Design an enzyme around this catalytic site. Sequence first.
Site, PDB file in Angstrom:
ATOM      1  N   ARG C  78     -10.950 -11.547  -5.524  1.00 36.81           N
ATOM      2  CA  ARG C  78     -11.918  -9.633  -4.953  1.00 36.81           C
ATOM      3  C   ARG C  78     -11.948  -8.966  -5.888  1.00 36.81           C
ATOM      4  NH1 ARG C  78      -9.719  -7.997  -1.213  1.00 36.81           N
ATOM      5  NH2 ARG C  78     -11.983  -7.998   0.433  1.00 36.81           N
ATOM      6  N   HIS C 124     -14.189   0.495  -1.520  1.00 30.00           N
ATOM      7  CA  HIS C 124     -12.210   0.656  -2.332  1.00 30.00           C
ATOM      8  C   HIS C 124     -12.153   2.328  -2.157  1.00 30.00           C
ATOM      9  CE1 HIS C 124      -8.804  -2.149  -2.887  1.00 30.00           C
ATOM     10  NE2 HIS C 124      -8.621  -0.630  -2.765  1.00 30.00           N
ATOM     11  N   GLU C 170      -8.823  -1.003   3.225  1.00 31.52           N
ATOM     12  CA  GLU C 170      -7.962  -0.190   3.868  1.00 31.52           C
ATOM     13  C   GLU C 170      -7.909   1.438   4.244  1.00 31.52           C
ATOM     14  OE1 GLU C 170      -4.131  -2.169   1.064  1.00 31.52           O
ATOM     15  OE2 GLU C 170      -4.173  -0.314   1.742  1.00 31.52           O
ATOM     16  N   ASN C 306      -3.884  -6.717   4.863  1.00 34.33           N
ATOM     17  CA  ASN C 306      -3.015  -6.015   3.482  1.00 34.33           C
ATOM     18  C   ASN C 306      -1.637  -5.917   4.345  1.00 34.33           C
ATOM     19  OD1 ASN C 306      -5.029  -6.267   2.601  1.00 34.33           O
ATOM     20  ND2 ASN C 306      -5.385  -4.200   1.628  1.00 34.33           N
ATOM     21  N   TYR C 308       2.453  -5.706   3.329  1.00 28.49           N
ATOM     22  CA  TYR C 308       3.641  -4.888   1.681  1.00 28.49           C
ATOM     23  C   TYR C 308       4.999  -5.131   2.563  1.00 28.49           C
ATOM     24  CZ  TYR C 308      -0.511  -4.531  -1.085  1.00 28.49           C
ATOM     25  OH  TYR C 308      -2.195  -4.719  -2.234  1.00 28.49           O
ATOM     26  N   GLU C 372      -4.864  -8.822   1.232  1.00 26.45           N
ATOM     27  CA  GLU C 372      -4.027  -7.983  -0.545  1.00 26.45           C
ATOM     28  C   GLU C 372      -2.246  -8.402   0.300  1.00 26.45           C
ATOM     29  OE1 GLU C 372      -6.581  -4.779  -2.441  1.00 26.45           O
ATOM     30  OE2 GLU C 372      -4.131  -4.111  -1.522  1.00 26.45           O
TER      31      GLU C 372
HETATM   32  C1  LIG Z   1      -2.399   3.653  -1.323  1.00 23.81           C
HETATM   33  C2  LIG Z   1      -1.458   2.338  -1.184  1.00 23.81           C
HETATM   34  C3  LIG Z   1      -0.923   1.678  -0.123  1.00 23.81           C
HETATM   35  C4  LIG Z   1      -0.861  -0.262  -0.044  1.00 23.81           C
HETATM   36  O1  LIG Z   1      -3.116  -0.158  -0.289  1.00 23.81           O
HETATM   37  C5  LIG Z   1      -2.917  -1.492  -1.278  1.00 23.81           C
HETATM   38  O2  LIG Z   1      -1.507  -0.939  -2.325  1.00 23.81           O
HETATM   39  C6  LIG Z   1      -1.986  -1.864  -3.828  1.00 23.81           C
HETATM   40  C7  LIG Z   1      -0.758  -0.983  -3.854  1.00 23.81           C
HETATM   41  O3  LIG Z   1       0.183  -0.712  -3.312  1.00 23.81           O
HETATM   42  C8  LIG Z   1      -3.103  -0.882  -3.973  1.00 23.81           C
HETATM   43  O4  LIG Z   1      -3.738  -1.953  -4.929  1.00 23.81           O
HETATM   44  C9  LIG Z   1      -4.555  -1.186  -3.314  1.00 23.81           C
HETATM   45  O5  LIG Z   1      -5.853  -0.955  -3.487  1.00 23.81           O
HETATM   46  C10 LIG Z   1      -3.943  -1.069  -1.997  1.00 23.81           C
HETATM   47  O6  LIG Z   1      -4.517  -2.221  -0.831  1.00 23.81           O
HETATM   48  O7  LIG Z   1      -0.131  -0.641   1.067  1.00 23.81           O
HETATM   49  C11 LIG Z   1      -0.104   0.182   1.678  1.00 23.81           C
HETATM   50  C12 LIG Z   1      -0.063   1.545   1.404  1.00 23.81           C
HETATM   51  C13 LIG Z   1       0.936   2.429   3.075  1.00 23.81           C
HETATM   52  O8  LIG Z   1       1.053   3.616   2.690  1.00 23.81           O
HETATM   53  O9  LIG Z   1       1.628   1.633   4.198  1.00 23.81           O
HETATM   54  C14 LIG Z   1       0.500   0.718   4.569  1.00 23.81           C
HETATM   55  C15 LIG Z   1      -0.126   2.139   0.326  1.00 23.81           C
HETATM   56  C16 LIG Z   1       1.117   2.132  -0.591  1.00 23.81           C
HETATM   57  C17 LIG Z   1       2.084   2.889  -0.023  1.00 23.81           C
HETATM   58  N1  LIG Z   1       1.994   4.262   0.038  1.00 23.81           N
HETATM   59  C18 LIG Z   1       3.280   5.060   0.501  1.00 23.81           C
HETATM   60  C19 LIG Z   1       4.637   4.949   0.019  1.00 23.81           C
HETATM   61  C20 LIG Z   1       4.373   3.697  -1.194  1.00 23.81           C
HETATM   62  C21 LIG Z   1       3.392   2.463  -1.394  1.00 23.81           C
HETATM   63  N2  LIG Z   1       3.401   2.005  -2.407  1.00 23.81           N
HETATM   64  C22 LIG Z   1       4.355   2.615  -2.758  1.00 23.81           C
HETATM   65  C23 LIG Z   1       4.491   1.605  -4.114  1.00 23.81           C
HETATM   66  C24 LIG Z   1       5.615   2.202  -4.194  1.00 23.81           C
HETATM   67  C25 LIG Z   1       6.117   3.143  -4.471  1.00 23.81           C
HETATM   68  C26 LIG Z   1       5.895   3.839  -3.292  1.00 23.81           C
HETATM   69  C27 LIG Z   1       4.929   3.534  -2.634  1.00 23.81           C
END
Ligand SMILES: CC[C@H]1[C@H](O[C@@H]2O[C@H](CO)[C@@H](O)[C@H](O)[C@H]2O)OC=C(C(=O)OC)[C@H]1C[C@@H]1NCCc2c1[nH]c1ccccc21
Lengths: 472, 464, 464
Positions: C78, C124, C170, C306, C308, C372
């Site tokens: 992807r 994106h 996203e 997605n 996490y 994701e």
């Molecule tokens: C901005 C990325 C968001 C992330 O989006 C995907 O993340 C991948 C890596 O994180 C990225 O490669 C891809 O492009 C996205 O589809 O997911 C969600 C986030 C979020 O804030 O809540 C859902 C975000 C991440 C989240 N935000 C708050 C704090 C935090 C987040 N990820 C990390 C990672 C490490 C430390 C702190 C954080």
Amino acid sequence: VVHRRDFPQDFIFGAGGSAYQCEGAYNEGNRGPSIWDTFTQRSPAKISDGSNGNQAINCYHMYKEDIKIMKQTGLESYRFSISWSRVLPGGRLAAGVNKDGVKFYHDFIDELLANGIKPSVTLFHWDLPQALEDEYGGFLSHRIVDDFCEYAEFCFWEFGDKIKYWTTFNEPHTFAVNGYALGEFAPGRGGKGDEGDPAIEPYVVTHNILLAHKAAVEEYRNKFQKCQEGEIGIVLNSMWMEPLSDVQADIDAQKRALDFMLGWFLEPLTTGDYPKSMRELVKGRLPKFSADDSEKLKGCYDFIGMNYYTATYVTNAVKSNSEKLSYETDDQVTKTFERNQKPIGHALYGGWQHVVPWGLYKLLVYTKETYHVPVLYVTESGMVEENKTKILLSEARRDAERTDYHQKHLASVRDAIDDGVNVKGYFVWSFFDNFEWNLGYICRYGIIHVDYKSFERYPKESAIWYKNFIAG
Amino acid sequence: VVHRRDFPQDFIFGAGGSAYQCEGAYNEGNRGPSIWDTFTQRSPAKISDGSNGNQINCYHMYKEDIKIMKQTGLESYRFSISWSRVLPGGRLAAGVNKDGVKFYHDFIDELLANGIKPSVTLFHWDLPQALEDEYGGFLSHRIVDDFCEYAEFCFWEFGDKIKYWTTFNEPHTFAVNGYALGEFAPGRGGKGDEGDPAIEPYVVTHNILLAHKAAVEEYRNKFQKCQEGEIGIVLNSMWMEPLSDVQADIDAQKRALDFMLGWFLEPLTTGDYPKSMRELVKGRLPKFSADDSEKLKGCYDFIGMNYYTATYVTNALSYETDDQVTKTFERNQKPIGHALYGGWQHVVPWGLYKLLVYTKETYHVPVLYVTESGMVEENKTKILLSEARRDAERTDYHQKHLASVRDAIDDGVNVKGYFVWSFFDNFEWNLGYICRYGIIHVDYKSFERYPKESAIWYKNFIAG
Amino acid sequence: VVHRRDFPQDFIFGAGGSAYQCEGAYNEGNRGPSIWDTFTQRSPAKISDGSNGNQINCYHMYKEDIKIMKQTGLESYRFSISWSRVLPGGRLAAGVNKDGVKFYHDFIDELLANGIKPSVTLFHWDLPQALEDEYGGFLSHRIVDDFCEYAEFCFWEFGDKIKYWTTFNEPHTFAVNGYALGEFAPGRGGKGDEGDPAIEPYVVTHNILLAHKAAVEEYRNKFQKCQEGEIGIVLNSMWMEPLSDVQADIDAQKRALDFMLGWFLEPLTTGDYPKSMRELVKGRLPKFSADDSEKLKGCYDFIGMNYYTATYVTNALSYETDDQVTKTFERNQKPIGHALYGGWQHVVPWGLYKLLVYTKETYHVPVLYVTESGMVEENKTKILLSEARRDAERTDYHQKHLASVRDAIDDGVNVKGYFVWSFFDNFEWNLGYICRYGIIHVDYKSFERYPKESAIWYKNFIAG
Ligand SMILES: CC[C@H]1[C@H](O[C@@H]2O[C@H](CO)[C@@H](O)[C@H](O)[C@H]2O)OC=C(C(=O)OC)[C@H]1C[C@@H]1NCCc2c1[nH]c1ccccc21
Ligand SMILES: CC[C@H]1[C@H](O[C@@H]2O[C@H](CO)[C@@H](O)[C@H](O)[C@H]2O)OC=C(C(=O)OC)[C@H]1C[C@@H]1NCCc2c1[nH]c1ccccc21
């Protein structure tokens, strides 16, 4: 009747072009869009025939050939311009420096030199990076002055080791009047239905141009002139203003028309302040120079380039109803090409250019008289010509009228040097037929014919005349 | 309202171009000038905007073009060999230009590499200058024999891979605007021009038929067995609708048709020109020898047919006048159909119907294809690409038109092919570039290529 | 404990990247700057380590990358088109950049040349600068219409070979961190920044939905029939677990979810935003016209999802505060799950389960894919490649996670796809390169590429 001989041993003979009008390849070699692309692409109805400088005449691919044609012609020097946005695509330096671009210029420079031709670089010929226009309004903001400093500096550094003739602005009067008052040229504001304010913007723009010019010049003087052994200047333009009759009203009108087109710029670079004529009429709409700016602006150029096309009868005008406050009207002067239905000179294709060889004389002499400038160059000089399609190349290139036009014009230039004024250069506009801004390709200016489709290039009789004349 | 399914399983969907109007590179890869270069170079005041086929540059950009074809989903594309690019000097002593025959092979192989059927018109008015010059071109029986060699070279050279051959595209036009109106290469006959409009057109088409005949026999006898292909000839007509229901008008449609289509079909049927022509042109209309007549009868594998519009017709020394028939697009100041940019094209979907049906009824032809069909469009400069490409009216145009073609099949007539004219926007002959015909937009300056809505529509439709 | 077999015969196993985070070569091959260049160049103090997507160089090294994909055994990869590389200036007048559209074609063809399914996200977050600049980007209804042209160009350009399209990756993130937190391009709303955090995010996602809608209709109506593909939209959420079993906490999960996921899904279901949002945001939440509502209902072919982590949730003028819901990872100072490098990601395999199940229950969606899924990892410099790559914890991570995804399928919910984020280590947006997400290690300096244990694990697992 006029030969090489009647001109100083050191006088330079040349011709010119300018990035947007020539280079084409707007979207190749990593170039960043200028306001001129955008103008012509988003607003194609503001172009006579709807066209754009996307391919222009393709000088970007064909340089080696063109410099061939130059040397055939016997040009002593060519005047071209760096597309700001080809070296710095995003305008400022964070956007980065585009290596493909700086290769071209270097290749190009080196080619001129490799053929015995003197390089002469205008920094800005209206192809302001879109990136900047967009971020802070371009020249509507004092942010531009600083970025123009960087641009200037980069160039001097990158290329200046080999060019001894720099130009900051080409016809900033035009750039701002057509740009922010008429709405006729990038970015196309001020005119009716348009987005700007014609009473305010022009003055702001030119104010910043001068402020940029100043920073540009200082940069060079203090950090580069000592080594590169070169000279920076600014090229301006005016029509000659001929009083329609010998009344005071007309006589004064000439001063206002001159001040408001030329003085607008020269005066600052002379006294440190704008023409009183303008301070008087424009009042609070005409920005003020810091006490330091004024001083640092005084005599702050190495030479004035001068572009001439035509002259108009001039007169004080009376309107005052549906006047909108605008730069157009502020020099209370009605122009006209007619004395008593008699035109001032023969009327060339546009309806605007009239051949008045003697206006160049009067203007130069005027510029000594009123601006006591050390070094003067006629940097743009030439006649328009309708682009007749439906005629054979065999015909289009017998541009006797153009030969004549430059003869007569050179005759006045000689006559200016002879009466004291220190002209040092004639520069045919334009070397090649190119993209004529808002008129697109409906006309032609050059001594080398260019087929706007095939990009093929055949020399006009004028070119040939010139080849012989350069060689006295 | 009309889908793929309404058409035979075997029906072919396509589009076309034409050497002079597309290839450009007139003077590269060793091509010899055609009359159409010459016309357009020596006589550029006879071109609406003064332009020429010198450069939409399909000659360099084929690989790209074939991509666009395959995106659009074309089952076959119809192009033409510039006679003068494989035989620069017209005849065989002048020599065969290898650069040229590489291009066509490269090009054909590219089509097939992408699943697209190649379909080669031999002649589309870019006759080699060398020939026009030497013996007057089609004004001489010398042309028949050289056309045969050209034809033969080709079939031999490429034919092992193309199964649809065409001898002449629109010979009626070629000869009528060429030697009567003086409006197209070589530009003779018309006012102030060099020809004779009472004689030439007839001599010219008389030779074209003689050429087509020789081309076709070559093929049937020496190549058909092997390559298993089919040669034909593509003709054209307006539909002729009687202005009113009186006999004068009825008889006029007969004349109008005979003089434009019969001029060709009738020979290729009975071995003789329409009696209507024989009666009116008398001694200025040449005769076919006894042998020629027979070998000409049923001498085609198919008729292609180009349709654009239809005109009301009525009763009224040059060919223009000889079919004593006044044409007009107005009934009672009502137009026959909506008036497209030119003033000439009117949308009359049902004229295609009428015309096809007529051709079965009158010339009993085995296989017919609609080989050119499409709507003109003003080349408005001063508008965004965003807009130019929303050619709703052109989608509609092809819908309505296919609608009538279905209806023709449904009533007996054996159409086997629709071919959009023109795939790409290109050089519109004596109108140069002031108009557009295509389903793929082409920037006449940059050569850049973006698909119109029409092309998208067609992409879906081809895919039922 | 979990194998290939526990999953449908048709389930797809994959991984992903994203233009800005991968391609590099921001200023080569004629690409036009996106807001994310600009953000990262003009505002590099907002990046953890000051870095940028200027150069992991997938743009030059694709052929190699596709090798690594195929070694790993990926069924599909992807990636995303940099809008600004095919349309440098954002709209169509700025022109189509041929270099760019060659790359994607080269790239797509490479995938297929190796047996890997191409899957294209359209957007994106690398919106062209030119557009952001001209009319404020997604703060204007101007974007909807240009997004349509972009969408359309694409499908037309490449779609004849990709059968999985995604409109937005996203959008929640894009708009929330973009115009609320000021932490991501264009960086508005947050403290000292230029926007308004009470207004913008809502306007932005309101347009994104309007864009997605137009993109999707384009596709269904003009391309679906032929290319036989499927468009959807990928969304994201944390799972929201009530902190305790009181109603205040129960209602909070509703709000938390609505405000993050419902914000998008609900429109794409009922044609209206979550009542929870309507009630709280009132007049700052724009309305959909009567028509928009209907055309929006069930306006996707699938939802990508997605995941996490998950947060405990409870009861508490800007969007951050509007879902009056305090988030926390601690129950009784017990973490919800093991705390990964960031402080944000906690391993909660069962949150994916809960969330998927929720989405069926609440938005009755036809097809779901986990698009994701992956664990963050500290970019420790000062350790040997030998070590870095023994990402045991990441293998485990994906195991546990697939374990919950199986469990979701088994209880009705129609997941059809697991997609490791991210195939390669890449540019982690506002954290630049201080962390890693990938199953393939990438030397942020040399661009060199060595596979982690995780990738090997996955190689075996894909192969049951
Ligand atoms: C901005 C990325 C968001 C992330 O989006 C995907 O993340 C991948 C890596 O994180 C990225 O490669 C891809 O492009 C996205 O589809 O997911 C969600 C986030 C979020 O804030 O809540 C859902 C975000 C991440 C989240 N935000 C708050 C704090 C935090 C987040 N990820 C990390 C990672 C490490 C430390 C702190 C954080
Ligand atoms: C010469 C083109 C004839 C055209 O031949 C084909 O036309 C395509 C585009 O028209 C062309 O690309 C292809 O090569 C041909 O197969 O068709 C028929 C003509 C004709 O006069 O009556 C039938 C001709 C066109 C007709 N002539 C009279 C006035 C006129 C015509 N076409 C236009 C278009 C716009 C304005 C006026 C006209």
